[PDB]
Design an enzyme around this catalytic site. Structure first.
Site, short mmCIF file in Angstrom:
data_model
loop_
_atom_site.label_atom_id
_atom_site.label_comp_id
_atom_site.label_asym_id
_atom_site.label_seq_id
_atom_site.Cartn_x
_atom_site.Cartn_y
_atom_site.Cartn_z
N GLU B 60 13.57 34.62 -0.47
CA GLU B 60 13.46 33.94 0.82
C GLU B 60 13.83 34.88 1.96
OE1 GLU B 60 16.26 31.15 2.67
OE2 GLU B 60 14.84 29.56 2.17
N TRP B 82 10.67 25.80 0.24
CA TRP B 82 9.96 25.35 1.44
C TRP B 82 8.72 24.48 1.23
CZ3 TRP B 82 11.63 25.93 6.42
CH2 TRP B 82 12.72 26.79 6.62
N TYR B 146 11.90 30.87 10.46
CA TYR B 146 12.63 32.11 10.66
C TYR B 146 11.85 33.42 10.74
CZ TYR B 146 16.47 28.85 10.11
OH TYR B 146 17.38 27.82 10.26
N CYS B 198 18.76 25.55 11.51
CA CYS B 198 20.17 25.26 11.22
C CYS B 198 21.03 26.47 11.63
CB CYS B 198 20.37 24.97 9.72
SG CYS B 198 20.02 23.27 9.24
N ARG B 218 24.72 25.46 13.36
CA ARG B 218 24.95 24.18 14.05
C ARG B 218 25.23 22.98 13.16
NH1 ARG B 218 21.08 20.57 13.62
NH2 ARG B 218 19.01 21.24 12.92
N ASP B 221 25.59 21.73 5.11
CA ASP B 221 25.82 20.89 3.95
C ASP B 221 26.79 21.71 3.10
OD1 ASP B 221 25.60 19.94 1.22
OD2 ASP B 221 23.74 18.94 1.81
#
Ligand SMILES: O=c1ccn([C@H]2C[C@H](O)[C@@H](COP(=O)(O)O)O2)c(=O)[nH]1
Ligand SMILES: O=c1ccn([C@H]2C[C@H](O)[C@@H](COP(=O)(O)O)O2)c(=O)[nH]1
Ligand SMILES: [K+]
Lengths: 316, 316
Positions: B60, B82, B146, B198, B218, B221
């Protein structure tokens, strides 16, 4: 005491801050990554171990909230924090036909003669902006500064976005949102700016009917800047919470590069020998709720009893 | 031990995390504002108290560095992190003429029949993207993720900006810059996105010949996400430091809203009763220095000896 986190940060920089040279040729002592929170229900975090001009903080923040980018507003409130940036434009423009002002910063600091002629063209400039509308519109407008980034972000489609106004509505209709963010950092503008925003981005958060706010500051001057930086954001948290009818929570201040310029050592040490006094109390206008329409008299500080002000040089 | 900050965060959320409802109807226990640092010269912070698939992390991250936004690359490496986001596009498009997939998330979780038909249209989809170029280009391309935010930020003038590539040069020519920032947060796109980034923004810092990196997340989990989040950035720090010929420093991870979904309690408690083992070691290719040209085999993890993997449900 309420301000202890600030004093602790200072001590830490003096204790373990490694020397790191900076562009101003001055030299600093820095650390990377630090966080301190302030419980706003315990009082307003305006430093008592040193006198800080709240008036300058109110007038600049309100300038921001109005989405203003023109110095005139500030000059009208005797605020000269942003003058230099505008003065530069004037000095460099071909319309300027007076004494040479090449690097008037350190030059006015290392020269007694210059530190009067420079302080003349400046007072001259401040007079034109305040009275000459055409001049104010041309030289008094900074363009890309907090007021326009917060409330008038320019899109590719050629429009404008009121980040702050939108986020405040989101809080009212979706208080538990984890996307209550406002960014002042635009990758397109950054490389052409003289001073890319220090206060890069901030996030709001709500729980139990209380509003908190976290600020990410990429660079910080422990001595001169931080005392102000803290009051600006602790204040914005109150204003936003006033508008949304919420209670006030915490102000979390996160730092990237926190530093002390070598020429402020004795001053910071001196302050550290002082004992913090009980913090002041903020008082906002109850009959007025639209914070964007707020004005000086609508915000008042009570019981601020600080130690005498401490003088220190600037870094250039 | 190296991973202790993570376990400490978890305990803290269980101890003082106030209940805060979330959109997924699940419910969480959260806190606002937290920071933890990891000294990367002590080992790679890949959790040993639970098995984490490094392969998924490498594939990733490399996907990101290539400025890629098309799932195909991931599918080619058996990475399905994804898929859902792309599958949504397919299901909603009029070109889709098969079984109804309304809110296939919780539906496939609350229905045994559906959790097979859904897992069929998905495998079907993944096959088309991998083989049908026209399909891949249309449905396999996520657009704003990203890879394009880091390396292809779209300007108003209609161009593209390689934030990451530029910042890496700045480090090489101005290591002491306090403006080594990369933002994934664009006020123009955020309101129209299904999932605004995130990992909002990160900053690099150099001192004594060592590269550090601070990340502002921000939302997080604690159980499922953070274990990954830490390895992605601890890894990017190594890659960037490899490219710049610097030594590795610290990875400071800053959180806005850190949370535990109520359905992960027993799992997090179970993990907390385990004792961390010595951390693994990272190994990058010495003969290869252009990190943008890096590939799987150029990055290797040594001595990772984790506890057995822990199963937990998703939040929907
Ligand atoms: O509100 C402000 C504005 C400026 N500074 C300081 C941070 C740095 O000392 C200097 C900016 O230098 P750069 O970080 O941009 O390189 O000004 C603050 O601390 N607070
Ligand atoms: O890399 C990631 C991606 C997602 N999440 C989590 C954060 C939240 O639990 C949820 C996103 O919800 P919002 O914050 O966008 O509202 O996904 C992570 O922790 N790490
Ligand atoms: K941004």
């Amino acid at each position: 005491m309420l301000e202890q986190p600030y004093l602790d940060l200072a001590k830490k920089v003096l204790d373990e801050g490694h020397f790191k040279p900076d562009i101003t040729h001055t030299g600093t002592y820095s650390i990377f990554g630090h966080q301190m929170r302030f419980d706003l229900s315990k009082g307003f975090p305006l430093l008592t171990t040193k006198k800080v001009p709240f008036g300058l903080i109110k007038s600049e923040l309100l300038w921001f909230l109005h989405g203003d980018t023109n110095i005139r507003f500030l000059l009208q409130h005797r605020n000269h924090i942003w003058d230099e940036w505008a003065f530069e434009k004037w000095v460099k423009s071909d319309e300027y036909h007076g004494p040479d002002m090449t690097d008037f910063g350190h030059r006015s600091q290392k020269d007694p003669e210059f530190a009067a002629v420079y302080h003349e063209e400046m007072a001259k400039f401040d007079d034109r902006v305040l009275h000459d509308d055409a001049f104010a519109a041309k030289y008094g407008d900074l363009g890309l500064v907090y007021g326009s980034q917060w409330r008038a972000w320019h899109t590719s489609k050629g429009d404008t976005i009121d980040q702050l106004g939108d986020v405040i509505e989101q809080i009212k209709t979706h208080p538990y949102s984890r996307r209550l963010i406002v960014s002042a950092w635009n990758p397109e503008d950054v490389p052409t700016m003289a001073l890319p925003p220090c206060h890069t981005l901030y996030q709001f958060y709500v729980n139990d009917g209380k509003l908190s706010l976290q600020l990410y500051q990429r660079s910080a001057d422990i001595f001169l800047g931080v005392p102000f930086n803290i009051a600006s954001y602790a204040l914005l948290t109150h204003l936003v919470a006033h508008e949304c009818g919420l209670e006030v929570g915490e102000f979390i201040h996160t730092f990237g590069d926190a530093h002390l310029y070598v020429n402020h050592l004795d001053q910071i040490k001196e302050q550290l020998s002082r004992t913090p006094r009980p913090a002041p109390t903020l008082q906002l206008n109850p009959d007025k709720h639209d914070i964007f329409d707020f004005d000086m008299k609508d915000i008042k500080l009570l019981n601020y009893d600080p130690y005498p002000a401490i003088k220190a040089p600037v870094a250039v």
